[PDB]
Structure 1
Amino acid sequence: SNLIEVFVDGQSVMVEPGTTVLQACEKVGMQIPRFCYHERLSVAGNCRMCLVEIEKAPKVVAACAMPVMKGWNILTNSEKSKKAREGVMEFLLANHPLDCPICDQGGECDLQDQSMMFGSDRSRFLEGKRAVEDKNIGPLVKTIMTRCIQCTRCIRFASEIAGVDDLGTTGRGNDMQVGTYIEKMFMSELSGNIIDICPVGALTSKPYAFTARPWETRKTESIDVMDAVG
């Protein structure tokens, strides 16, 4: 019908108009690295981890936000894509705190795993790190904002899914901080979900703190009975 033909590493794919590069990549089983993109949230495009090279194009594009075009050949594993990933990971890790042994995210961290799979294995950052003050948003979500990478997933979830506009960014530049700018509890019937969407240990569960590691746990898939939603 209206399907257009693109190429992922030379493999032809038929996609609907408006499909992004990331979704076209997903169709053939290739997952593009991401930090700010969530498939149930608005497209942000700020983390820049999803940069990929289009054949015969000099500038890499943000796969999460760029619609595909007819005849495009997406090169997911080229030198340009890998160098972009390494540079973005280096910038992400320059100011990140050395907190993994005391961070509850350790073992199920997207930052850790994508650094292992797409980043470099060492550092050349020879400066001091930034440190930001912590915020209190209630007894449910523990907050350690030095680990924040400014993906704005929590803000987008709060505005779009929960309907609460209490979260935002204050300042600018390297000093931009995610928070409420005042002492205010982010209290919602769906607030705890921002623990799951947060890719790092910036937001964690307070009742769960320090009790377990992800590789220890045994998972049982079952149903909730606290209401009739199931």
Structure 2
Amino acid sequence: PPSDHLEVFVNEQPVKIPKGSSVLQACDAAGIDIPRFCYHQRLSIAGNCRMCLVEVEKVPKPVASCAMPAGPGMKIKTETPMVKKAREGVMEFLLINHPLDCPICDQGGECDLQDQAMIFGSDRSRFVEAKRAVEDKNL
């Protein structure tokens, strides 16, 4: 085979991954668990939550690691100041319209949004506007 396993660098550590793997899968093979909301292993890739944003060398923008394929010799950084600022900003955008519903919500205690806000987000908000309200649906 023409080198069916390619080598990438995650935080200066060499990682061998199968071909066609994304940046997120290379981060997972390096022992790093990237925060995510829309990616799933069993579903198709969407790339709309913007929580999986990491930094790749010679790219001026944060890339979405779930959707971006991993190229040969790629250098991935997951703990630079722009990655942490990106995570806090995306979490702040996720929380401005969310209802203050954790006491009455059934996910409280096993919530991805709560735990990811505790770990990768900030501790304050600066939002004092009115929120979006949605009627419920019968399914």
Q: What is the TM-score of this pair, normalised by structure 1?
A: 0.58
Quote the residue 2:136 is aligned against.
134
Distance of 2:117 and 2:103 partners within structure 1: 16
Tell me the matched-pair count: 137
Quote the residue 1:125 is aligned against.
127
Quote the residue 1:103 is aligned against.
105
Deviation at 1:56, TM superposition (A): 2.8
Quote the residue 1:166 is aligned against.
none
Amino acid at match of 1:114: Q
User: Where in structure 1 are there 5+ consecutive unaligned residues?
Assistant: 138-230
Instruction: State the percentage of identical aligned residues.
Output: 71
Quote the residue 1:17 is aligned against.
19
Deviation at 1:71, TM superposition (A): 1.4
Question: Which SS does the other structure have where 1:98 is aligned?
Answer: coil
Q: Map of 1:65-80 to 2, 5 A cutoff?
A: 65-80=67-82
Distance of 1:107 and 1:15 partners within structure 2: 34
Question: Which SS does the other structure have where 2:28 is aligned?
Answer: helix
Larger radius of gyration: 1
Task: Tell me how large the CA RMSD over aligned residues is.
Answer: 0.8
> CA-to-partner distance for each residue in 1:62-118, whole Å, 9 max, x for gaps?
000110111111111111111111110000000000000111100000000000000
Distance of 2:84 and 2:65 partners within structure 1: 14
Distance of 2:44 and 2:132 partners within structure 1: 29
> CA-to-partner distance for each residue in 1:178-204, whole Å, 9 max, x for gaps?
xxxxxxxxxxxxxxxxxxxxxxxxxxx
User: Where in structure 2 are there 5+ consecutive unaligned residues?
Assistant: none
Deviation at 1:55, TM superposition (A): 2.0
Quote the residue 1:30 is aligned against.
32
Distance of 1:35 and 1:48 partners within structure 2: 8
- Which has the bigger relative contact order, CA under 8 A and spacing at least 6? 2
Quote the residue 2:93 is aligned against.
91
Amino acid at match of 2:72: K
Quote the residue 2:62 is aligned against.
60
Q: Map of 1:169-184 to 2, 5 A cutoff?
A: none
Deviation at 1:29, TM superposition (A): 1.1
Question: Which SS does the other structure have where 2:103 is aligned?
Answer: helix
Q: What is the TM-score of this pair, normalised by structure 2?
A: 0.96
Distance of 1:101 and 1:27 partners within structure 2: 37
Distance of 1:126 and 1:55 partners within structure 2: 38
